Every structure is written in C-alpha cells, then in structure tokens.
C-alpha cells in the first residue's frame, strides 16, 4: 500500500482506485492490482469460483470467463495489437504502428513505427516517454528514476530529487528533508546547487539549515512511498 507524505493527491492508478472503492462497498468482486498499480491480466471473482482475463483498463475480454484460473491471457501489449489490427479491418485504417512485445509479453522498451523510420522509448505501460522519438533505435532508453529526475527539472512535482541506482531505477530506501518550521519539503535541488559545501558533513548542514530534519522511507518500483514506513 502506498501513501505519500506531503502530497494532496495520491499517485494511485485506476486499478488501485477501483480496488479501494470496491473493498469499501464490500462488493464480491475486488479488482486485483499488480505491484506497480496495473490490473493483473487474470481477475478472479468471489472465492475464485469464476475467473476471467481483462484488458489494460480492467474491462473483461469476452469469451474468457471460466470456472478456475484461465490457462493463458494475452498481455496488454498483445491485446493492443489485436485492437489495432481489427480496427483496420473493421474501419479502414492504414496502420503506421504495431506494438512490439517482448517474449514475456510486456512492451519492448524501444518501439518503432512500421516503416522502421521513427523510434521512441515507452514506459512499462506502452506509453511514450516524451523527448525520446527520433530516427532509428534510441541508443539507451532512460529509466523511471532518471525520467522522474528530469521532469523535476521541468517544474513537475516537489523539489527533492529521488535517489537512483546505477541502472537508473529507484533505490529501495528514499530519503528527503523536511523543514520543521513550516512543515514543508525542503528544496534540495536548489539548495544543493547553491551550497554544495553545506553538505560535506552533518555539522555543516545543520549550521546552515538548523530547522531541517531527515525523512526516509521504503519505496516501490515506481518510487512511491510504501504506507507506514516513514
């Protein structure tokens, strides 16, 4: 479970919103969500008597409902390929892009148009990472923690850069600073750039920022704070 410190709007994905609303209304079907917040491709029912497959939006794929767990469900990358191809047959469209899926079923990190002319990087949900479209395969697709850090420099979110692993993923332990006076997140990106000498020791840090305390927590794969670990 995730619950961030300062944010007013929690970064909950649609499955996690529909799961919480259903558990509250004591419905007999409560959506099952993956660790990253996506719908699991197999959705069970009350006691698992009936189970079906779903698409990326949680909509049941017709003909899949079954007593017992379905033997195989198409991934969201593969289910998008079907809807594009049927669309052209149903509604004439000269396709320019068909998703490329890894053999595990997830989206390939690099996605190319059918002319192999333009390519871009997608996230784990098939969504284009902005600024990655170019001619030919991108040499190195940025990872989630690196993307979060760049968007922070463009004015998105708070001013505390998350700590990244060498591969570009989030480190499991995330640490930020809190200004205890106004109870706000300490502006780390600007303070570090203007006062790099204040970060040599904790003696020099608390001399310059005497009201600032540390706040660390466990983060999930998307960098979101796990509930009640701060």
């Amino acid at each position: 479970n995730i619950f961030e410190x300062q944010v007013d709007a929690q970064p909950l994905r649609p499955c996690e919103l529909q799961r919480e609303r259903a558990f509250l209304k004591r419905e007999d079907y409560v959506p099952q969500c993956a660790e990253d917040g996506s719908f699991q491709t197999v959705q069970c029912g009350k006691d698992g008597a009936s189970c079906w497959c779903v698409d990326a939006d949680g909509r049941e794929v017709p003909g899949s409902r079954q007593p017992g767990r379905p033997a195989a469900c198409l991934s969201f990358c593969q289910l998008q390929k079907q809807q594009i191809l049927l669309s052209s047959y149903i509604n004439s469209t000269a396709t320019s892009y068909l998703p490329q899926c890894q053999d595990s079923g997830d989206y390939s990190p690099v996605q190319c148009d059918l002319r192999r002319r333009q390519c871009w990087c997608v996230d784990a949900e098939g969504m284009e990472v902005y600024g990655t479209r170019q001619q030919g395969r991108p040499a190195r697709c940025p990872r989630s923690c690196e993307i979060r850090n760049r968007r922070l420099l463009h004015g998105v979110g708070d001013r505390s850069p998350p700590q990244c692993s060498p591969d570009g993923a989030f480190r499991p332990v995330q640490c930020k600073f809190v200004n205890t006076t106004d109870m706000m997140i300490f502006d780390l990106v600007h303070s570090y750039s203007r006062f790099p000498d204040a970060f040599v020791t904790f003696s020099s840090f608390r001399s310059r920022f005497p009201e600032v305390s540390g706040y660390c927590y466990c983060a999930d794969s998307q960098g979101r704070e796990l509930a009640e670990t701060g």
């Binding site: 600024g131 940025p142 420099l153 463009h154 990106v189 750039s193």
Partner: protein, 323 residues
C-alpha cells in the same frame, strides 16, 4: 524569357512581361525532403505521375506533356518596366514576429559559407513597405531554414530578399556573454531582421549528460546568461534553446568565472570536440586534460549534455566543423 529543357523532353520557351518575383536561384539550399504539393520551388513535378511531368512556371501551368536539365530565366536589365504606358497592350500580424538587427553588429566577409534563398521583388509593383512584408512573411513560412531575412534596394529594378539561417559565429571561450559572437554576412544589408525565438512548452529531446568534464576544440553557437533565474528554470530554458537550433548537437549548463563566484551560463554547441576527464575513469592514472578551476561543471544539474545520438545527420545547411 524563360528557357526550359526537361531531360530528354520537349523544350519550353516562355516569354516574360512585368514579372513580380523571380524566385529560385541555382545556389539555394532546398529542403531535401520537401513535398512537391507544397509549391515546391523547382516548377517541374509529378515526373511520370501518369507518365506526364507538370510544369508550374510563371503563373501558368503547362499541361504536363513530357517524355529538368536546363532551366533559366533571362532579364532585360535596362528595361522600361517601371516607366511604360499602359496602352502598349501589356500583360500585418507577421511583422511582430521579427526584431530589427543593428546593422553595425554585422561583419562583412564576402568569402563566408552561408546557405541562402534569394528572391527579386520588382519595384514596379512592390513598395518598400510591401517588400519588407513579402520578405518577412516568406521567412516565417520556412520554419526549418530561415532565421534571418535581409532586404536591399541597391538595384534600380528590384528589391533583394535573401533568407539566411543563423549567421552568428562565436569563439570557444567559456564566458557568459556574447561579445566574441558576430554576424558574418557576405554583403552589407540595408535592413536585417531576425525571427524572435519562441520556446515551446515541452522539450523535444531527452538529453544525455556526458560523463566527461572537459571539452577541447568545441564549437559554440550561442552564449546566454542565466543568473537571473532558478537553476531549474535555467536548465529548462537551455534545453529548449538547443531544441530550437537545428544545428545544435548539445549544450553546456555551467558556472563560468568560478574564481569570482561563478555565473550561471547556457552554451549551445554544434560540436563537442574532444571529450576528456571522465569521473568514472582516470582514477589512479590520468593523462588527459583535467582540472579547470575557473569553471564549475560537476554539481547537479551542471554538465555537458548531448542531443540523443541519431544516424540521421544535421540539416545540410549547418556549418561544417572539424577539430
């Protein structure tokens, strides 16, 4: 008169009377991949569309009967064009995008390599007001090539409207101001107008920070001070300035004059030169250039940034740069 010989086809011989704008010059950067539908400059088009090559010269389109090679116009220089009796049986929202350039900043070296697109607007129907508006409107219609538009009236029959890409040339000194940057144009322009840079909302490239801290033999395109901004805002602007330059291969976001306290600076580059002094290597044994104390390029988010590596090269009009 116009003379046209499509390759191994019929030969056209058009006569001209009171033309308004001669438009395509043999030495003009033409867009390598430009749709023939969008009034492509060379009139010939649709070669064998249905085995017929249409010619849209003048204002009149030849049917297309053609089974290119030579195409020229000729002009009677000492013409009576402007002073001719009519009985002889003859026949503002864009000016705000530009800003005049102080002609003094221009250096005139006739030998410079600068691609251009020339036009002749004839004076018998063009006033200097209209010529300045025709020239500016045409520059704003070529958003991939034209950064500068100059107008000249040093000729008796026509105004000259030549469009340039960015003409600024800088030295490789890491400094916050553009004082070693000059405009080099082949001729003195009567009026020189620069399209105002407009920053898009989003960045178009995901720039990669170089691991190297020292660059040798760089080529700078522009120097912009950023000390009146937050570090986050300055980085965001530096990214979008290199986005707007088709010849930019990367930028530097750094403190210069660090011995006097440092000044936040954006340097757009069209060549990164020799990249040395990586933080990952040279730990026990360093031989290359390192340790420049008047520059701060280490602290996040300072650094040298590269536009993502693509096998598609820069536009052909971009200046050639070599170590």
């Amino acid at each position: 008169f116009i003379l046209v010989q499509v390759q191994g086809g019929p030969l056209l011989c058009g006569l001209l009377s009171s033309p308004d704008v001669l438009l395509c010059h043999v030495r003009d950067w033409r867009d390598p991949a430009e749709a023939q539908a969008n009034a492509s400059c060379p009139g010939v088009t649709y070669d064998q569309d249905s085995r017929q090559v249409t010619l849209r010269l003048g204002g009149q389109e030849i049917r297309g009967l053609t089974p290119t090679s030579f195409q020229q116009v000729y002009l009677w220089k000492d013409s009576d064009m402007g002073s001719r009796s009519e009985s002889m049986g003859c026949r503002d929202l864009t000016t705000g995008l530009f800003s005049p350039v102080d002609l003094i900043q221009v250096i005139v070296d006739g030998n410079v390599s600068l691609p251009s697109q020339q036009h002749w607007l004839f004076k018998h129907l063009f006033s200097l007001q209209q010529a300045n508006l025709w020239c500016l409107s045409r520059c704003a219609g070529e958003p991939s090539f034209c950064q500068l538009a100059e107008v000249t009236d040093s000729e008796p029959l026509y105004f000259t409207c030549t469009l340039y890409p960015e003409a600024q040339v800088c030295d490789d000194i890491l400094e916050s101001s553009p004082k070693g940057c000059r405009l080099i144009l082949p001729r003195r322009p009567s009026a020189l107008y620069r399209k105002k840079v407009v920053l898009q909302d989003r960045v178009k490239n995901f720039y990669n920070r170089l691991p190297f801290q020292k660059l040798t033999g760089i080529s700078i395109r522009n120097k912009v001070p950023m000390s009146d901004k937050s570090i986050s805002s300055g980085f965001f602007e530096c990214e979008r300035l290199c986005d707007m330059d088709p010849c930019c291969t990367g930028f530097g976001f750094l403190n210069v004059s660090q011995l006097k306290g440092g000044e936040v600076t954006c340097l757009t580059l069209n060549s990164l030169g020799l990249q040395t002094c990586s933080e990952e290597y040279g730990g026990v044994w360093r031989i290359l250039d390192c340790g420049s104390p008047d520059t701060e390029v280490r602290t996040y988010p300072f650094g040298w940034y590269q536009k993502p590596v693509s096998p598609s090269d820069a536009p052909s009009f971009c200046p050639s740069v070599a170590l």
